[model samples]
Target: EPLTREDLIAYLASGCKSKEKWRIGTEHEKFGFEVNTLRPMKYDQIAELLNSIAERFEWEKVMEGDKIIGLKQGKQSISLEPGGQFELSGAPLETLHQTCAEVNSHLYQVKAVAEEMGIGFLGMGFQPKWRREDIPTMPKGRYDIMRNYMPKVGSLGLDMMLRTCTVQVNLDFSSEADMIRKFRAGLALQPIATALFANSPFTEGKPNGFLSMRSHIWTDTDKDRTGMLPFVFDDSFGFEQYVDYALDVPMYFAYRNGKYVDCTGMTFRQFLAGKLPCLPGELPTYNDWENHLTTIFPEVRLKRYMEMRGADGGPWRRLCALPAFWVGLLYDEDVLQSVLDLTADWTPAEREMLRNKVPVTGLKTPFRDGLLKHVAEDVLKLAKDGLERRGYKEVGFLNAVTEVVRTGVTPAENLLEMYNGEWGQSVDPVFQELLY
Candidate 1:
């Protein structure tokens, strides 16, 4: 009838598997648009694509209130974001090579089905052409709660809900101490990740003055849930400290009887004590804790494993590159410790300041005495060495990241040149380049 600190610690420790057993999992989303008019896909068209993918790939159907909205195959799932963006959540695999393969295979499946239906998918961070009013939201119950609640918290929260995409990696730890080190390192360097993969230079069909507008939108999307949490760096930081923080975060919804029951503004601690007014007298379950964890949108989030959440959605190679960069740095024991040392002395204010600049200056922003580019270059080298030493056949995956630092500008900056040039003068050409 009571929850214990020991129980919470044990739950966190359960994610600590052996080194050889470490896994890499990815959740990548892409914006869907009509090929003929370049507009966001409609509801009927989205359902058609979902059922088509399911029939073509032999994936079983997943329904939300009788609507065939998702498809599942083994640990992989084809799900819909609130704005009808399609996502492929890959199964946890032992190597980056397998992870990349999963991504490619998923893309190939979507490409084939989409080609027949005149549907195009864009792999950037934010919706480059569609206005917020022009987009249609999915029919998921959970999203209904979010749609009503987002604008109450931030102006850009609706844009984040309906228009953005990301490529996130889930990594494992060896122990409580190891998780703390990896978590702090990740939270500190998220700005670097955001800069290196900055793909969203435009919104509503023009430059919005940010390298990663998706990252920028997150700054205002629910202040209680999302941000760079510096408290992770404190020596007292561990599983118990995380539990206390998560306990107070206002919940968005809770799954009950096959539907999302609106629990917005209710704290999970109240739910745990069986005092939630909406679902009074019902005790919480592990599944409730899992959903509660998802509601927290920190730059570096912790659930069963640590999620590297800073990178913007990008091209196929960049998608693989996101996980590769994190895996090489976090999975390798020696490399992980080295990166922790790199950010050991950086103050939380410095980390947040650098984060604020990335949407505009990206790697070129000044930090400490040098520039963020210097930090990016240093961190990328560590990832390269880690990947090489690990001897994965995909060691060359770090090249994409190296290219970004070599130029001292992110992919966003490069795209701005195109925006100022041919595509810069237009969205159709930019659409052709990104979606094709």
Candidate 2:
């Protein structure tokens, strides 16, 4: 078997789907904590939690040797984040109704299992009360390679790995031209998405200054792989262009024989050249290329589908709202074109500045003539209209988001107010109040 550049390009192009056949895939992560101790759960506890959920809910165990690292049931999966942040990678669904039901069922199942074990899961962008050292790691082999390599790349890389959680939506495109338009628009407005879902207001028991500290962490996580990819806005950008960008991002690991081989300090381009000294003369396979694509962490990641990687993880309402917001904006032809026209004049510098400022100021970040909230208000109306036209009665999912736009206040701001008011300056109440 042989691999070719054409094959890689085709792999990306393969994600294109007919407009009628489009689906929305949602993924979200949350921190697991002991309800009594308020400490992050250890690996043993996390394993027991996963095993209990698997046995009780009929999810098949996804094991790493003796460890029950994850669970899979059909297209949906319960995977562990680096620091044992429990994640549900939702199945692709045709309607937001089904998507919301899927999320509801998952939270119900997890809560059912967790209550007995005295464990609670909290949904927010970052772990509010614990330091990086207080978090526990999963038994996954890939995380080991990532943990060791992170410090070499950036100061906040470890924090991004161990402390952050997020909610994202995966979407489809009809063709390369559609993809370019969607990618550019998605990348351009991701800062607004970040502002709308800004929930990571605290760090180690105190206000972290930045409203979305999880989003800010990404700013220094890895220059090579993360950021607002400005090249996507270029007139010539397409699936092949994205493949070239991914190929240059440094490799994390390549799975083989149920183990992870560290491929740090080398790019996929080098691996494609058969220059991997660790496994000399071995060219990458389709699986290897797929693994490489997952490692690149741009704001909007392109695989067979587009991933909206901007929003912070929050409560049930916000989780469902993420998919609704993205699907409304991207799935509708008229809305997509409208959004493209709206963002057509956003220069890369302005986009980059928005990315940098929104984490701190949230919707209050200034754009050309007004605050980012103004743009958010306009976008939410378009999103609502698009969702209404979708015929699923899904516009209601954006109600929580509509409230955010109306007040010009984000979830993080409310949390901060609680910290200053009712919570009495303690982050401990979050474990109980925000528990999923």
Candidate 3:
């Protein structure tokens, strides 16, 4: 059964923390490309590298009570922090493109350093034809939880952690209009973005055929939780609907005294109603609600901010392009409408078809209306208008976007072009060029 209004309000009020600003952060996986010759880098190597990068960049460690990390700049926090993955955050919507540009620039600098040390970066979705046992696991509690719960849902758990990185765009909502427009725009544009940025083509050491095989793995990994949420597009997209949907989701665990109770089979709504047993005299709190949110995998997730979980991570330079693409079109009215008009006739069935086909053929696959070319062209136009409106008149920035769109090739296409020369042979040289 779904959660009631009161249950949702109590859950949200207790769990939802107020976001301090509107900002975007990109989650990146290093893929152990630098250290692992047999597979990707080991988990310990990644953790050590993150610390090294943080120290070298003068980024303060985001430990408890660290005021240096979350410092406000314009409308967001400009702090670099370490999680299970490496993340870079700090920039407003107005400055997003420039911020991405700067971040990519820095990433190239870092990549150059890594390459000099014999490290390489490959942007494939899965280790094509590879199995979970091929990679090393991150020795973290969260990873352990994921490892345990994921196998129950699908065999793709290890692939998700070991072989995947995504470029997630988080935004803020000030009103219902903001929420509704974002919902419509994000859902409509996600497939286009997926096609345009399909970078992951290999999984488990063989050619999986899809551009974004990571997306495909996700479908097999957790059907109960992950996938597109079409209901959000209904006329009444609101907090109530979100809460109702959230309550029915299977909970990972209930926390108590710094430990997880492993409530994977029970829903939070049932737990709240005392239908399930808990530690004697123990009660759920806001933290539990926060923990539960992480378990629910909707296409567009709402928490303190909205997270756009569509595009897979690409080369360092291309990573910047994605945020620019999303913010430019979503924030600008004309650009937003242009995007909507561009995708107006795109039905859910069409999106599913593209999703199913992208991993194998990528942009190489022909669509009914020449969708790959049409969408790419329109995206560049929208980005141009958006950048100009934001007072970004830089020619270099505009040219970078124009070049990608003009070719009708996403980063994945570029990778495929290189792959045609010989798989993994040209990756180092291409990555080196991007870095240097």
Residue 355, candidate 3: how far off, in angstroms?
Answer: 3.1
State the weakest 10-residue window (summed lDDT) of model 1.
1-10
Best by TM-score: 2
C-alpha RMSD values across all candidates:
1.2, 0.9, 5.2
* Candidate 2 accuracy as TM-score: 0.99
The model with the greater lDDT, 2 or 3, is: 2
Ordered list by lDDT, greatest first: 2, 1, 3
Candidate 2 regions with alpha-carbon error over 4 angstroms: none
Q: Which candidate tops lDDT?
A: 2
Candidate 1 RMSD to the correct structure: 1.2
TM-score of each: 0.98, 0.99, 0.80
The candidate with the higher TM-score, 1 or 3, is 1
User: Clash totals for all models, in order?
Assistant: 3, 0, 23
For model 3, give the 10-residue run with minimal summed lDDT.
64-73
Query: Any residue pairs clashing in model 1, and if so which?
Result: 211-359, 418-424, 419-424
Residue-by-residue lDDT tens digits, candidate 2, 217-336: 999999999999998888778888888888888888877777889988887777888888666777999889999999999899999999999999999999999999989998888999
Model 3 TM-score (2 dp)? 0.80
Put down candidate 1 lDDT per residue, 1-436, tens digits, no spaces. Answer: 6655456556667888788888888999998888889989888898998888888889999998779889999999889889988899999998888988898898898889889999988889998887999998899999999999998898999999899999999999888888998898899889999999998888887888888999999999988988888888887999988988888789888889889999988987787678988798777777788788888999999987999999898888888899999988888889988998998888988988988888888998998788899988899999888888888776777777888898897888877888788663666676678773
